[PDB]
Structure formats: structure tokens, C-alpha cells
Amino acid sequence: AALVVDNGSGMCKAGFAGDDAPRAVFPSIVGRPRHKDSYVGDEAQSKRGILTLKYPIEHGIVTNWDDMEKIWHHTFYNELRVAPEEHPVLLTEAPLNPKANREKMTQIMFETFNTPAMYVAIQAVLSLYASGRTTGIVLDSGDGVSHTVPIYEGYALPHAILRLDLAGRDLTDYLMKILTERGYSFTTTAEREIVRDIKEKLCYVALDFEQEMATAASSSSLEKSYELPDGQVITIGNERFRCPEALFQPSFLGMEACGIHETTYNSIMKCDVDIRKDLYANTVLSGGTTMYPGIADRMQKEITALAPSTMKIKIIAPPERKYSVWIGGSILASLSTFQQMWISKQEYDESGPSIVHRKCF
Amino acid sequence: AALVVDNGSGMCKAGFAGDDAPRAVFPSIVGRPRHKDSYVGDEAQSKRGILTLKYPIEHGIVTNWDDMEKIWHHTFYNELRVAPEEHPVLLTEAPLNPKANREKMTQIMFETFNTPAMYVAIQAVLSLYASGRTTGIVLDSGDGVSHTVPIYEGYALPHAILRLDLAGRDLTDYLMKILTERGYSFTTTAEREIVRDIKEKLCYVALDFEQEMATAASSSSLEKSYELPDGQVITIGNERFRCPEALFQPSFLGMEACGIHETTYNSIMKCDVDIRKDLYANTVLSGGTTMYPGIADRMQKEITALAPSTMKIKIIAPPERKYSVWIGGSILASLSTFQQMWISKQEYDESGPSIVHRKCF
Amino acid sequence: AALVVDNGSGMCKAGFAGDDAPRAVFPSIVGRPRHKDSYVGDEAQSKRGILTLKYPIEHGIVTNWDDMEKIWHHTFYNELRVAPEEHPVLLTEAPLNPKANREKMTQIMFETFNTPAMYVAIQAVLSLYASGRTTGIVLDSGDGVSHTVPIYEGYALPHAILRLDLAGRDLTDYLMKILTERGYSFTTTAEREIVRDIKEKLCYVALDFEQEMATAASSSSLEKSYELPDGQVITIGNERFRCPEALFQPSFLGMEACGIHETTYNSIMKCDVDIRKDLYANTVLSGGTTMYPGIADRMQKEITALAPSTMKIKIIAPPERKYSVWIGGSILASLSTFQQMWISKQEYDESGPSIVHRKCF
Amino acid sequence: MASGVTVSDVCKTTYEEIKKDKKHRYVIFYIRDEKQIDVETVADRNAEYDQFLEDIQKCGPGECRYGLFDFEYMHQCQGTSESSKKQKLFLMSWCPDTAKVKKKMLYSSSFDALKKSLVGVQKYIQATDLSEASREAVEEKLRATDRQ
Amino acid sequence: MASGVTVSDVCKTTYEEIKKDKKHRYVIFYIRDEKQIDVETVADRNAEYDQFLEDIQKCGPGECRYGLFDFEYMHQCQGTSESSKKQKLFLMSWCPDTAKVKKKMLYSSSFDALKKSLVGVQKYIQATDLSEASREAVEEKLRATDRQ
């Protein structure tokens, strides 16, 4: 079975082709003692009090290759417990990944991990295909970054790809801040995970933010309780929908950026007029940060308001969209006919790392 | 004369506008018998052996309004001995105070205490203005909490405000602990006040902590004596500078937080690049916990090390910074031209508690 | 065989590694004539009428090194009748022992007693390990002091260690007082030992103190008799359980402190949320003052009431807990593999007294 | 605090066979002659957790052991209808309350040596009775580390 | 221990006039007919402490009284160059050593009644001679409560 590795800014997802879900999901972080020489993933996270933590992927782009190799090492040997030299490997990449990074990735797989074959796939394209479409726009929002990626007949349109450096991690921080305003103080990293858990379980996107604020002021109907690990029960009110509102209004975080609905709209407008209709009618949500209840409806509403009146708007929110990228890769790599599509070690030895551009794009 | 009330987490400061210093300074605590129905301030503190003591303000935020009303009642009738219905009242608030709390405060002043007029001012902004500046960053450290508050042209920048739940009270506790290690045991609340007194009289911030530790190990030159109320003389050594070191190294208290120098730096970095230069050149210290000898120099040194090399660094430590917030309010409220700036009872009756946001911000 | 010396505030325990119990147990006191130049241990105690008695260890901390050397001299030459220069020596220390004291101890062993090797171990850690655990919280209550010591994976958590200057000696004094109220007068030191004996033989901890008081008032079923050395028989009633109640309610002694159950709880709460569950489920009792019948049940009850409802509570009261610290040291030091763990005289000569921090912690 | 007890090479080898090669499901360690941690029992890859509990206790109610287990459980990510199989290695210190103090001291003071020798273990579990070693108890501990 | 002596309403009224209204500086109380504490002397707001000492002793060297005073003094907060005016109410029990035992017993056993009736007094002062009632002595006691 081939190995499938989705390289996220904040989370690494890894498993075996053909599986319905990744086997391993862990933070993409490397920790080193402030005063093993290094810790990776959950282990690093559990020792965060004494470690300096770094992310080798920043907003979808690998910026630290030494640490990235450690992440992959940890993925293959510690999480999946396999020898990579025995398995073809499919890796995902973010949109707009530099060519040099792609080549470096290819080099490390063949030369450092000695994989027999490898393939690189764009995260947004996998997600789109997994939805049965070849033409549409993907709003991909993970832990570290959000992208709008227009795709036409299977080809991403680089000129029209937009990036918002706002995603799940930022929202967790934001929630921490506004909970503090309510009187709950979460100051430690461990506590941050608790807040993340609160966010993922209790937060939602309001259809009408102002109306929801009014409701929250006049009634306790929107309040939910959360039991902390120490047994204390806290009550969360309008923080539930204020937190993800930051996606639509980045100003909540002090960012001078357009929200995800406007960004999506702007991405479509950067495309040729003849394909815009298709993009409006095929907006696919992907990534963990798109799992908020109500987000699809809110997107539908907001895009309808921005688009020409005659335009059909369709937001697609697959249920499995948390792992859509990985699932797409898993299915693809499990096909017997896909075996011919791999970059082989032999091909790499003959053509060098630049072969990745010919075989995968 | 208007009344000025600075609402601190640990201390309440109150007096008359135009005065050079508050008339009353007392603990912001309410005590109730464990087995008058309640005691406030010094009285509560003097009976602490038989009372359960609570702070209605936690880290700058009012969390108990019933008790807060008692504090104010005690302020007006017991400490200042005035009828609040005859005096306009200026109240201070911490940065990031929730809107709801501001409104509640406004409601209580007009409806419970029947003040003819009131105004709310942000503590850090008052301190900055009192230094003749409208742009800078304030390190406000009181009894219960420390804040870094960047201010640009008179407006606090909420996204860049950072909080450290470490201040004077924590240091007093810490000093108690390390004195115990030396063989002095202070276990009672009364004794805690003694330790506070020791801290405020004898403690200082070392420019170089490691060097100072070495000096303390090799010589008794840094030792100071303190006469206890019972006549016993104790000797304090390296505890003198270890105690306030906790501000720069919160790990001394077991806290996973950045020290006040790093926090200040981090606050500046959260601001727009174009105003950072102004913030570096205008760092204002405010609050009782900033009264340690050497703290300004230490801050200067530490920020210089963190900031770009071309950056001018200026730490401002006004002599009156213990009460800078109150003094600023006192002066402001004493101006004849300020009379037009008050929220009047009439305005409150017409617009409700939300008027505070329009008139004071 | 190595020598094992447990340095208690009130009692010194000493013997040979591998033994099941200490060979010598004696008061840690030095006496000098008010008007041999000095007497130590039982000898000092037997001459207490004409001697001024001092404790060189106060609440677990050595405060008088001259006297401590006499105690050790007495331990090696008088009690164990061995030459320390021929034996490695394991010494125990209380939690939060100052580094300087540790170094001084190390210096005295190598330079004054010329031991070939030495090791220092923390009392609470030894006790925990002796129970087969590496993670838990130890309630260590000896003659002079009680500690709650959270330990995680073999490391004590200094920030969460709490001390109660109430233990066996205080209880003996208290019992003397309340027996006097019943009409029995014990005024001499010799008589105090009798009271200690009464306390250790007859006293117990009530599960429900109020109910037990009611029972004692309505029936003589709780009364026990004790024959004095002169043949007189005295009857002890509700003093039997009032005395150790002082551990749970220090107010019985006029102390403004939390009882041992609250102190334990408070210690746990000072720890990270992720380890609290382990601490609740692994509370180990250690020390002579924990030998009261019923104390484990009472602790179980009280902690259950304080802890979150979902929390599993387990109190561990080993039968040998009177000497758990010493036994742990005895076993450890008897292992052939432990020989590599000693600080050797050579290492000390090369590195000085600071070597103790590297080799033992 | 350390006993000075060493870890045999076979322990490291067996550990690699479980972690990397997935040749075995679990291994039980014991301290030989109070001097060295060694391998007592190695179970095949298809062995179940119940067998692990039986093996770790097989030498009597007062006997202490260490156990390494490659634990498999189903994990459902919030928001996804799909359960994925997770595998985590844990290392258990088994020191029953019925054990003698000497044995308890020996095993507790030697545990760190074993931990340091076996790099990559996800969770360390302390157990003194079955309530702490049960499948449910262990799984709960392992899940507590699951990145939401 | 209590004598059963009651406190007149006028005492409470006068107390409020001093504490809240700042109408008067101090008041001297006495026990009328051994039955009730009542107001003897009320001094204007501008009265000084020396006058208070004179008034409380005015009835003779063996006479006991109670005195309430709104005491003003300058307080310099550590670290601040600015002295602020502090005002604290104290209640003094004046029982000179020269007083007869009966009077001493009466006033000492009635003091608690007065304390309970006058809520908000910051400091209670016991004085048997001038060394205990002097401005310096009183100020020292009042400062001892000053939050550093």
C-alpha cells in the first residue's frame, strides 16, 4: 500500500492508500529544549512547557527543511511504523508552492528516505476531484492558512489564487482572548488545547451576525456549557459565534484583510468571465476550519449578495471535508491504474528533481 | 469637587479632583465571617483571621458586582465621607474592560449612588497623558495584574494589548516563600503585610541578575536588615533582587509566561510597523509594582537587546508613577473645561448605560 | 554496607542499607547545661531538666550546623558504632531544602566525616518510590512538619509543594493541654513523653468528627484507659480523636492554616491540569504522624468532597509508612547497581560541593 | 532518583521490532538479578490486550513488571463521519499493591532507565491494579493525547 | 462581658454627622445615671486635637469618657514624593488610672455597646493617661493600619 501524507501548516495527516481516513493526525511541530535533541508532534506538544516549538510549514510553505525531514521521519517511523523504502509515497502540497520547494521535497523522498516511488498532488485539486468535479473553486481552510483556489478542468489558476493568513489556529487564539474577557483565563499551552476543543465542539457560524448578537443579549438560549478537565463547568455565550465570525470579518483580529466570502468573490472575479459562472456554481469547502455549523449557509448568503443577481450560487460542503484532501489522495493512490503515474526512483535518477513538474503537473 | 476613584485589582485609590495624591488608599477586598454582615478594605484586612476575603476585581476586571458596590459604598461614605449624589465621579478602568462591565458600572453610579455626573477613563491612557504624551506604550503593573498598552494618538490599540497575571501580590507571596527558605516563617496574613512592607522597602531590580547573584554569594554587601514589629531583626540577602526578578522571569513562580520586557516587546511587534518606532521611544512605567529601584534601567537594557539596533529606546519612569493613573484623573477632572465632558444624569436617563461609549470613547 | 540517615526535624533514623528497619531512632536534639559540654539524642532528653534543648532542624531545614554535626557524630559513633570513613552514606532531605544547605551537608560528610561516598535523596520521593509509584502526591507528616509533595515521573514539583508547620510534636503539646482540661496535669518533659506515648497508642482520626463528639457525649464506649508508670490509671475520652483532629482543623491549635486535606487539595490545584488526575489517584501517606487509625479513610472522604465528582480518589497508606523514607533509602542503597550512583570522594575533590546537584538531581 | 539498573540490548532490539517492523504486538520486561532489565515475554502481532494483561500478571500477584504494547483503537475525528484506526505505543509500569516494598522500590527506581532506552513511546502508564491497567483505562489515557 | 448600658439615639445621630456629613470634628460621650451612653460635648469641624484632649479631661482627673475623633494626618506613600491627607475615625476609651474602680468597671464594660452602635470606626483606642492619648501615640496607632 502506498503512503499518503498531507502536509498541513498545523497538522500532519498520514496513512495508507485505500483507507477511509488517515491513521495519524498530529501537530506539525518540532520542539527543542530551551536550556532527545528534539521532539516532534504530540510529544513536542506535551512538553511544550520546556521546549521551543517551531512550525516547519508556514502558511502552507515549507520554510524549514531540517525540521520538515524530522516531521516526515516521525510520520514514517513513529506514527505509521513503516519503512518508507518499501512504499510509494503520495505527498500533498499547498497551492502556489514554489518549484524549488517541490523539487526539494522530491529530493528528500528519494535520497533521504529512499522511497521507491512518489507523487505530489495539490491539496485543493484533490478536494475538488473528491467532490466529483473538475471545475470549481475551493475554499481550503486548515489550521494555518485559508486559500481560495479556482480550478478549471483540473488546472488550478495561479493568477487567481488568493491567500488569507487566517485559519484555525488564529481562531483558537482569538477565542482564548474573548473568553478571557468573560473571566476565563487560559494562559498555558495545555489550556490552549482545551480552548481548541471548545471551539471545535461549541462554536458555529451565524447566518446573521447582528441578529445573533441581539439574541444573545436578550436571551440565554444560545449559551452552552463545557466541562473542563478539572471538573469545572464554564458557560460560553456569544463567544460561540463571535469566534468564527473572524473568518468573515478579519478585523475582529485586527487584520486589514477581506473575509473568506469576499476573498472567494475576489478570486472568481480574477478569472475569465466565461468560467465565472461555473465557479459560482461550484464552490467547495475543504479543511477543518470549514467544519463550523452554519458556515455553508453563511457562505451561500454572502456570495449571493456579492454575485450578479442572475448567477446561480452553490456551496458544496462535503461531510468528509475535514480530511477531503487526504481522502482524495488515498483513493487516487489506491487505484491499480495509478501505479503508472508514479515518479519512480529510476526516473528520478535519470532526470533529477525537476521530473516532478513533468509527471505530476 | 469631583470624586476620582481608581479601581485597582488589589487597591482602591480615591480622593478629590485637584489633589496631588489620593486621600484614601485601601485594599479592594470584602470580607465575610466564615461561621456586620461584611467588612471592607482595611477593616476586612484587620479581621482576616475570622473572615473569608474576596476580591471583586480580578486581573483588572470586575467579577463580583455586589461586592464592588460595597467597595464603592465604603469609598464614598467611610473613606471620603461624602455623599456621592453631590459630586461628579470619575472612575478608571483597566484596558480591555468588557463593554457590559462599563455599562454596569455606569448604571450603578447613576441608579444606586445617584451621582449627578460621571466619566470613565482608561488607566493606561491617563498615565500616558500624565507624562505629556499621546503616543507610547504603557507598562502598567499594579497589585494584581500587569498590562502592556500601546496607545497611538490617544487611542489604545486593543489588538496589541497584552496581559500578564503577575504583579505585586504575586511577588509578595513569592518573597514569603523564599524567605521561608532562608528560615523566616511568615504564615499569617498579618505577616504577609509585613512581607509586603519588606518587599517595597528593600527589594530592587538587578541590572544583571547573574552577576548580582555572584556578588551576593561572595559578599554580604547586598544584605539589608529589617526590624520586625516584635523587635526582631532579620537579614535579607539575595531575596532582595530575586523577588522582583520574577517580573522578568515568571518561571521563578512556575509560570509559563514571558516577562514584562518580552511582553512589552511582543506588544510593540503586534502594532503597525510605522508606529513601532514611537512606541520604543516612549515606554512609560506605571503602577506600584514599577517602583522597584533599577527597574527602568533593567527595562532599558532588556528592550535594547530585543529591539532592532537602530531603534531608539526610551523608558520613562515618572517619580509619581505609583499614583499616575489617579493623578491624571485628578487633574483632568479638576479642569473647568472638563465639566462639559461628563455624562450627566439627564443624558443617562435619555440614552441609557450605552451613553458611556459615546461620551468617554 | 552503606549507612542510611533520615534527617527528621524531631527524629533521626539511622541504620544499614538492606535492613528492614532503622537500627537507631532517637530525638534530633542537642542539650547543653543551663548553668560533657553537650548531650545528644536520648541522653539529652533524659537530662532535659538541667539542659537547654535545641533542635538543629526546624521544619525540615537545618538551621544549626554545629549541632547537626553533633547529631551525625552521635549517629555514627554512638548509635551505629561505625567509622563513617569506611562507609558510603545516604542522607535524606526535606522538600525545598536550600541548595546551600545541600552543599553544606555534602561538605561536612566528605571533609569532616571523611566518608568515601555519599548520596542525598528527597524524603517524599523515596516514600513514593517505595510504594511502587513514580507519579503521585505525598503527604509527609513527621514530628516537626507536614508537607504535601506532588511528584511527576520522579520529579518533585517545587512550585506546588506546600508546608504545614504542624505535626506530631504539636499534637503532643495539644494533647497535654486538653488532658489538663480533664484534670490530668503533665507539666514535665518526662511527662510529655508519657503523653506522646498515650497519643501514639490511643489516639485515632474520626471519620465524622461531629458525630464522634456526639457519641462521646452520650456514651463511654469511646473511652480508653492508660496505666501511667507510677501505676495510676487514667481515662481518656474525646481527647483520643480531638487531638489528631488538629491536623484537619489547625484552628484547634489557634493556627490560621488549612488542614492537611485542604493543603493536599490546594497542592494538587497548583499543578498542571493534565497531571491532577494522577495525583488524586495516587496520594501516599508517609511519616509517623500518619499512623493514626482512621486517617486514610478520613482523607479519602475529605478529598472526595473537595475534588471534582468525576475524579477517582485513592489514598495509599502503606503499613510501613512510619519509616517509608528510611526503608526506601535502605533498599536503594543496598542495590549493587546503585554503587555507580554515589558521589565519590574523588568527584567531590574535583568539582566541590556543587556536585551534589548533578549527581543526585 | 535512579537505581543504576541497566537495560539489556535485547530490550532495544525487541522494541524496534515492535515499533518499526510491527513484528510483535507487545513485550513484557523484568529485572534480572536486580541488575538488568531484560525481556521476559514477546507476543505475536495478533495478540490481544487481554493476553497482555494475563502475561504481565502471570508471575504472581506480588510480582512487578514492565510492559510495552502497540495499542490499536478507533478514533473518530470531530466533524468527520469516518473512524480511523490509531496506533500508539505505551509503556506500562506494573507494580501491584500486593508487591513487597523491595520489589516496588526496585522497579519504580529503574523505570526511568527503561524509558530513556525506548525512544518514541507515546504514553507512560503507571498501574498498581487492574482498574488502572484495564483496556478502558489505558485507552482513555491514550486518547487524552489525541490532537482534536 | 457587658454591663447592659444602652446607647442613646443622639449618639448615633451625632456619629453620622461626623462620619458622613463632616459637620463636626469630634464628640465626647459619657454615661448618664449609669444607664445610658449619651453626648456630652460636640466640637465644631475646625477643632483641633488638643481641644479634644482638653474636653475629654475637662470633668476631672478621675472621670471616664469616650471620645470619637475624625483624625487628619499626612501620609506619604512609599515611592511617591506626594503626601496625601488621610482621615480616619477613631474611638477612644478614656479611663484614667486615677479613676475609681466603680467608674472604671462601668466604662470598660459599656464600651462594647458603643462600638457596636458606631459602625465604621477604624480604630479603637484605650487610654489611661496622656501618654496613650497624645497626638503622637494616636497617630502611630492609626498609621499602623495604613496599607503600604
UniProtKB/Swiss-Prot annotation, chains A, B, C:
Alphabetized GO MF terms: ATP binding; hydrolase activity
GO annotation, cellular component aspect: actin cytoskeleton; brahma complex; cytoplasm; Ino80 complex
Enzyme class, broadest EC rank: hydrolase
Gene3D superfamilies xref list: 3.30.420.40, Actin, Chain A, domain 4 (3.90.640.10)
Database matches in CDD domains: ASKHA_NBD_actin
Cross-referenced SMART domains: ACTIN
Protein name per the record: Actin-5C
Source organism of the structure: Drosophila melanogaster
From Swiss-Prot, chains D, E:
Effect seen on changing residue 3 to A: Abolishes in vitro phosphorylation by LIMK1. Partial rescue of both the defective neuroblast proliferation and defective axon growth seen in null mutants
Placement of sequence motif Nuclear localization signal: 19-23
Keyword Nucleus listed: yes
Highest rank taxon of the organism: Eukaryota
Subcellular location(s) of the protein: Cytoplasm, Cytoskeleton; Nucleus matrix
Main location: cytoplasm
Homology family: Belongs to the actin-binding proteins ADF family.
Further remarks about this protein from its record: The name 'twinstar' derives from the characteristic aberrant arrangement of asters seen in mutants.
Name of the protein in its database record: Cofilin/actin-depolymerizing factor homolog
Organism in which the protein naturally occurs: Drosophila melanogaster
Source lineage: Eukaryota, Metazoa, Ecdysozoa, Arthropoda, Hexapoda
Gene: tsr
